[PDB]
Design a protein around this ligand. Structure first.
Ligand SMILES: C[S@@+](CC[C@H](N)C(=O)[O-])C[C@H]1O[C@@H](n2cnc3c(N)ncnc32)[C@H](O)[C@@H]1O
Ligand SMILES: [Mn+2]
Length: 631
């Protein structure tokens, strides 16, 4: 915990930002996006799409990135307007895009005709701008592939004398760069060691270089040429090898967060009623399954009695090579590997039954896969219709590169979780997932959070991130609730959620957003505040369409909690509490709703604090004494 680390952390994150942002800015500049918004200053996305013959989905990804960088702003009519910062697009050299295919391997080996001296000189001048952020964005285009190769060839871990075995010209090139950057003084400095030790965190972003090189095709050409799939069906938009290595390394601290959940499950008495099978959908190399088994064996009551009550780990994956690797990795662990697909839980269930596996004895688990499912369009058009008036900000791009409407992306996730919800047992569903943020929050935490680059390259590659609150809502709509004692989120202390660790349990009821359509039923409920009239409900529902929660059981309204969002959208407050005391177990259910509102508010983008929990907990906990109206 040293003083220099806070600036170093900002720098490395900014480098990853620039790795994605510079291709977006350059492609937009070349196609005339900034010029168009200078000739006509207020344009909606559809107008920009039409006039530049753009692909609406990828273009939305680019616009959200530019908004997050404060290059553009959106009016209340959803019209894009340039800012003074957007003139920075003129400072970017467009030859800089050549680095995305420059052979850094050959360069470090002296087998290259043309080196990188021009860019080293550019960096020393801070790219001819005083905007510190901007010069860090451009630095990232160069430094990310270079640092990764310097680490890969073991040119930085070398004791003391780094660059000592390189040709003298190479020595001076990299010595100048490292000295100019404060990385070396020839010995590495504090920041120099920091950048080297943390290089693999850039691997996932760096692996999308082939896609980012083709940004102009994504935005303005034929997106499918970027995503080939030839005969061997190797991915062309990403170096999956480096990607899988890097993401596995990053997924490490999150796997450890399943320890407390696993320890809790397999300490639960009696042993015979615990799960027998732990089934990981998308097992990859089996790292998570292997860890879980060792945790059970060493740290749980179940681990003392495996002789009498064995555990069986089950790896499921739609790729046979993954099953083979997982099979080998789970040597000496009782296990099974079977094919399956994240989108087909019904087929998984039938394959388990074909093995004689008793479905009710299964704990289902998975990590970081729901957002990478094959997108299935909504079949429930009526629920999709209702959903369409809500203000979701999910960005999701289809195979043609067109924008999937946010409410359609959400309804797809709901229906996909419903298919899973129908097979989840009383042992529940251990689920880790990564989430996108809104541009308002990304803009506010640009130096502290990875979202700017991570959300962009995810949406560009046709993955389906949602914001963390949207995910928890989609689960709640189908009766899956993330258990309070198991939950973890990252980042821990910033008002934004990029990662959730969940133990979902299946409950008999559902929680969804209240809508204007619910107002007649809401008017009839018992209510802690004096009875609310329709206009105030309309006011609340109009101002924050996705901030009021209701709990339903067998089509019957049980309870509802309305909220207010205030103070630069940093404070969420409980505003109304409604119940129907005619429904069996309504008080327990209403307490569950208030607990859910707290969890949901904890992951709501931008929310720093929740007000009113004590007041409204007391209201429902001492119901008769609190003297509710219309009871
Ligand atoms: C998401 S990445 C690896 C991360 C891994 N899912 C985990 O558990 O952390 C892809 C891995 O999941 C598998 N996978 C990708 N799409 C899948 C799908 N639709 N159904 C089942 N497995 C899938 C891949 O074959 C690969 O093994
Ligand atoms: Mn992903």
């Amino acid at each position: 915990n040293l003083y220099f680390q806070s600036n170093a952390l900002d720098k490395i994150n900014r480098y990853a930002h620039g790795f994605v942002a510079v291709p977006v800015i350059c492609a937009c500049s070349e196609a005339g996006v900034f010029e168009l918004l200078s000739q006509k200053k207020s344009l909606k996305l559809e107008e920009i799409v039409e006039h530049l013959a753009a692909n609406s989905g990828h273009l939305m990804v680019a616009m959200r990135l530019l908004e997050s960088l404060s290059f553009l702003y959106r009016s209340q009519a959803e019209e894009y307007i340039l800012t003074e910062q957007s003139q920075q697009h003129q400072i970017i050299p467009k030859a800089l895009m050549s680095l995305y295919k420059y052979p850094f391997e050959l360069y470090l080996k002296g087998e290259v005709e043309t080196g990188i001296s021009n860019w080293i000189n550019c960096s020393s001048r801070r790219w001819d701008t005083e905007n510190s952020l901007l010069s860090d964005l451009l630095d990232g285009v160069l430094l990310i592939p270079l640092l990764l190769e310097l680490k890969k060839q073991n040119l930085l871990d070398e004791s003391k004398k780094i660059f000592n075995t390189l040709t003298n010209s190479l020595k001076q090139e990299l010595s100048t760069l490292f000295i100019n950057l404060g990385w070396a003084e020839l010995y590495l400095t504090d920041i120099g060691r920091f950048m080297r030790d943390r290089s693999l965190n850039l691997g996932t972003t760096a692996s999308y270089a082939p896609m980012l090189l083709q940004m102009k095709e994504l935005l303005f050409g034929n997106p499918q040429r970027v995503f080939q799939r030839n005969k061997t069906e190797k991915e062309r938009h990403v170096n999956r090898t480096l990607n899988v290595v890097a993401s596995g390394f990053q997924h490490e601290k999150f796997f450890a967060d399943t320890d407390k959940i696993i320890i809790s499950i397999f300490n639960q008495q009696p042993i015979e009623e615990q799960p027998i099978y732990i089934v990981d959908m998308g097992c990859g190399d089996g790292t998570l399954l292997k860890r879980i088994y060792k945790i059970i064996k060493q740290f749980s009551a179940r681990g003392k009695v495996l002789t009498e009550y064995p555990i069986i780990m089950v790896g499921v994956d739609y790729n046979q090579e993954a099953l083979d690797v997982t099979d080998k990795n789970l040597v000496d662990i009782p296990h099974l590997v079977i094919p399956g697909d994240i989108g087909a839980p019904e087929k998984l269930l039938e394959q388990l039954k074909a093995q004689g596996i008793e479905p009710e004895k299964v704990l289902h688990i998975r990590s970081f896969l729901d957002h990478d499912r094959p997108f299935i369009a909504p079949k429930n058009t009526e629920i999709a219709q209702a959903r369409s008036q809500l203000d979701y900000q999910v960005v999701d791009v289809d195979r043609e590169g067109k924008l999937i409407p946010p409410h359609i992306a959400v309804q797809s996730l709901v229906e996909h979780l419903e298919r899973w919800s129908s097979i989840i047992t009383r042992h529940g569903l251990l689920l880790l997932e990564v989430h996108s943020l809104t541009p308002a929050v990304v803009k506010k935490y640009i130096d502290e959070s990875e979202s700017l680059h991570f959300d962009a390259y995810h949406a560009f590659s046709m993955q389906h991130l949602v914001e963390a609150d949207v995910f928890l809502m989609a689960a709640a709509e189908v009766g899956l609730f993330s258990r309070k004692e198991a939950f973890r989120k990252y980042p821990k202390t910033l008002p934004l959620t990029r990662i959730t660790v969940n133990h979902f349990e299946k409950r008999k009821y559902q929680i969804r957003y209240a809508t204007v359509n619910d107002i007649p039923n809401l008017l009839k409920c018992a209510t802690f505040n004096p009875p609310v009239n329709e206009p105030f409900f309309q006011v609340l529902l109009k101002q924050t369409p996705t901030a009021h929660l209701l709990l339903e059981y067998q089509g019957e309204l049980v309870a509802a909690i309305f909220t207010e969002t205030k103070n630069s959208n940093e404070v969420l407050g409980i505003r109304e509490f409604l119940v129907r005391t005619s429904v069996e177990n309504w008080q327990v259910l209403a307490k569950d709703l208030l607990e859910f509102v707290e969890q949901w508010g904890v992951v709501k983008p931008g929310i720093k604090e929740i007000e009113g929990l004590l007041k409204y907990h007391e209201a429902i906990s001492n119901f008769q004494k609190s003297k509710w109206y219309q009871s």
